[PDB]
């Protein structure tokens, strides 16, 4: 079964300048990856834990 | 803070750290029991850390105080970031000393060209991961409303101002949100947003504190 479309969305820090540790699926490296989210205007490719990211988007690389 | 300098221990005694098991936003002490921050920094069970320099090392002179109330502006809009301001009441009044002190609120709005001090523990680079241990500082001028709107078409409200440098290289960044912009000894701005950090023609955008002084006074008076 094909994965959700969110796995294809880009990393989006957004405009806000908070420090919110999150995870996103990097479609270039093919792995769930930590990033610092700003706190507003994010997309669906934005998870609170590594497992939550991996459950939606499994490693390809 | 990108392109700034090490403030020096406790040289910005109104600067606080908001902590949720880690530093996530800054804030400003405006009286012994109240802190001003950004609405997008709202969390439950916030611990306010006062008198900090090195956020990663226990010095012994810090004060940790739990938030008892956190109140965002009733007109805050998370999509446009209009009214990006929040008040945090401390469970107990902070002990005031040379390391923990309140910053005054303005009676009038500051003018373009005024040099201000912006501070925080945010990213010190415009990409990657370059987070400081100690508090960073930046001197930056308020930019004209016209240049702010040109930099961010259709995004600047009457409750925002730009400050910084159109050439890039010097700005606030992720981790600085909620922190102070102080001009002539008055809290004129709150670190809010921008397109990235320290990018050409993309200066930092700040909540216009002079527009909220009356709301602050009444909120304190009713809580």
Residue B30's nearest CA partner among B222, B164, B192, B219 is B219
**Could you tell me the residue ranges of all domains in chain B?**
1-12+103-210, 13-102+211-222
What's the length of chain B?
A: 223
Q: What b/e string do you get for B17-56 counting C-beta neighbours within 10 Å, with b at 16 or more? A: bbbeeebbbbbbbbbebbbbbbbbbbbeebebbbbbbebe
Q: CB–CB of A17 and B173 under 8 A? A: yes
Distance from CA of A29 to the nearest CA of B (A): 16
Specify the CATH number for the domain of residue A57. Answer: 4.10.410.10
Q: Rounded to 5 degrees, what angle do the CA atoms A16, A17, A21 make?
A: 100
- Two tokens, residue A37: 């989210």
DSSP-based helix, strand, coil % in chain B, nearest 5: 10, 35, 55
Number of domains in chain A: 1
Question: Quick one: which H or E segment has residue B88?
Answer: strand B86-90
CA distances from B184 to B7, B106, B112, B166 (A): 17, 9, 13, 23
Q: SS3 string of B8-76?
A: CCCCCCCEEEEECCCEEEEEEEEECCEEEECHHHCCCCCEEEECCCCCCCCCCCCEEEEEEEEEECCCC
**Catalytic residue (one of B37, B70, B102, B177):** B177
Q: Do B136 and B120 touch, CB atoms closer than 8 A? A: yes
Burial bucket for residue B154 (CB in 10 Å: 0-12, 13-18, 19+): exposed
Which candidate, B191, B182, B158, places its Cα nearest to that of B86?
B191
B172 vs A contacts (CB less than 8 Å): 17
Note whether B76 contacts A: Cβ–Cβ < 8 A. no
Helices (H), A1-61: 50-56
Q: Which residues of A touch B189 (CB under 8 A)?
A: none
Cβ atoms of B156 and B162 within 8 Å: the answer is yes
- Cβ contact (<8 Å) for B193 and A40? yes
* B1-12+103-210 CATH fold: Thrombin, subunit H (2.40.10)
Which residue reads 């706190």 in tokens? A39
Nearest-by-CA chain A residue for B19: A19
Comparing CB atoms, the residue among B78, B122, B129 nearest residue A17 is B122
Q: Which residues of A touch B178 (CB under 8 A)?
A: 18
Q: Alpha carbon B143 to chain centroid distance?
A: 17
CA nearest B142: which of B196, B181, B98, B101?
Answer: B181
Q: Judge contact between A36 and A24, C-beta under 8 A.
A: no
- Cα separation, B178 vs B86, in Å, equals 8
Residue A19 and residue B194: Cβ atoms within 8 Å? no
Q: Is A19 on the interface with B (CB under 8 A)?
A: yes
* CA B192 to each of CA A2, A10, B54: distance values in angstroms, whole numbers, following the listed order: 39, 23, 23
Helix (H) / strand (E) containing B118: strand B115-120
Q: What is the CATH number of domain B13-102+211-222?
A: 2.40.10.10
Q: Using what technique was this structure determined?
A: X-ray
Q: What is the resolution of this structure in A?
A: 1.7
Note down the domain range covering A36: 1-61
Could you tell me which residues are beta bridge partners of residue B141?
B115
d(CA A46, CA A20): 11
CA distance B223 to A31: 47
Chain A: nearest CA to B194, how far in angstroms? 5
Q: Which of B27, B123, B8 is nearest to A37 (CA)?
A: B123
Answer for the pair B39, B72: CB distance below 8 angstroms, yes or no: yes
Show residues of chain A in contact with B196, CB under 8 Å: 13
Q: Are residues B103 and B14 in contact, defined by beta-carbon separation less than 8 angstroms?
A: yes
Residues 6+ apart with CB under 8 A from B155: B80, B205
Q: Do B81 and A13 touch (CB under 8 A)?
A: no
Locate B87 and state its tokens. 């008040």
């Amino acid at each position: 079964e094909a994965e959700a479309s969110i796995c294809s969305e880009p990393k989006k820090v957004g405009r806000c300048k908070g420090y919110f540790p999150r995870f996103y699926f990097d479609s270039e490296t093919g792995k769930c990856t930590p990033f610092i989210y700003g706190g507003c205007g994010g997309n669906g490719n934005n998870f609170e834990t590594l497992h939550q990211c991996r459950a939606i988007c499994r490693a390809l690389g | 803070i990108v392109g700034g300098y090490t403030c020096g221990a406790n040289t910005v005694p109104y600067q606080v750290s908001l902590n949720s098991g880690y530093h996530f936003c800054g804030g400003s002490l405006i009286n012994s029991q109240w802190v001003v921050s950004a609405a997008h920094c709202y969390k439950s069970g916030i611990q306010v850390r006062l008198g900090e320099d090195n956020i990663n090392v226990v010095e012994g002179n810090e004060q940790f105080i739990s938030a008892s109330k956190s109140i965002v502006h009733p007109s805050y809009n998370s999509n446009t970031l209009n009214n990006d301001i929040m008040l945090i009441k401390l469970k107990s009044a902070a002990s005031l000393n040379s390391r923990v002190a309140s910053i005054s609120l303005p009676t009038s709005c500051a003018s373009a060209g005024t040099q201000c001090l912006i501070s925080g523990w945010g990213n010190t680079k415009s990409s990657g991961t370059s987070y400081p241990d100690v508090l960073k500082c930046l001197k930056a001028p308020i930019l004209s409303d016209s240049s702010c709107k040109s930099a961010y078409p259709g995004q600047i409200t009457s409750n925002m101002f730009c400050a910084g440098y159109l050439e890039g290289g010097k700005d606030s960044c992720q981790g600085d949100s909620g922190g102070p912009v102080v001009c002539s000894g008055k809290l004129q701005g709150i670190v809010s947003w921008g397109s990235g950090c320290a990018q050409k023609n993309k200066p930092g955008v700040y909540t216009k504190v002079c527009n909220y002084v009356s709301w602050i006074k009444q909120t304190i008076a009713s809580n």
